[PDB]
Amino acid sequence: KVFGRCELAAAMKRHGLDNYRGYSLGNWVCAAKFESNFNTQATNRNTDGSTDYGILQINSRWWCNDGRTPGSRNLCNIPCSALLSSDITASVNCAKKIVSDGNGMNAWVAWRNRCKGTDVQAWIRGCRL
Ligand code: NA
């Protein structure tokens, strides 16, 4: 599923991401935009053989099992394919574990390079939330 901007903001809000660990909703929508272009089916392979999955591009080296990333951990205890669902619940629950990991949202390279220090509130402007 490809989300609309406000549609995603609302879904994320409903799932408790708004100000989760101090990150306003705009941060999460911005990260999703540049990670996946709001497409839950986004996948991308990394040079190390791991793969990023879903709307927040969660990586198979640490967070999910895709059966083809040798010596990886499955810290969110889920098949990576569950991250590609139109229901973002698994992605959001796993993201909460990631953002709690010590580095905050810096774990998402696109957030660090493209959202961090920008006016992120613009990503939820105009939305009925
Ligand atoms: Na893994």
From Swiss-Prot:
GO molecular function: beta-N-acetylglucosaminidase activity; identical protein binding; lysozyme activity
Enzyme class, broadest EC rank: hydrolase
Entries under InterPro entries matching the protein: Glyco_hydro_22, Glyco_hydro_22_CS, Glyco_hydro_22_lys, Lysozyme-like_dom_sf
SMART domains: LYZ1 (SM00263)
S-S pairs: C6-C127, C30-C115, C64-C80, C76-C94
Subcellular location: Secreted
Secreted in keyword set: yes
Principal location class: secreted
Residue span, C-type lysozyme domain: 1-129
Any Pfam family matching the protein: Lys
Binding sites annotated in the UniProt record for substrate: D101
GO biological process: cell wall macromolecule catabolic process; defense response to bacterium; defense response to Gram-negative bacterium; defense response to Gram-positive bacterium; killing of cells of another organism
Keyword Transport: no
EC number: 3.2.1.17
Keywords on record: Allergen, Antimicrobial, Bacteriolytic enzyme, Disulfide bond, Glycosidase, Hydrolase, Secreted, Signal
Protein family: Belongs to the glycosyl hydrolase 22 family.
Oligomeric and partner information: Monomer.
Function, as annotated: Lysozymes have primarily a bacteriolytic function; those in tissues and body fluids are associated with the monocyte-macrophage system and enhance the activity of immunoagents. Has bacteriolytic activity against M.luteus.
Entry protein name: Lysozyme C
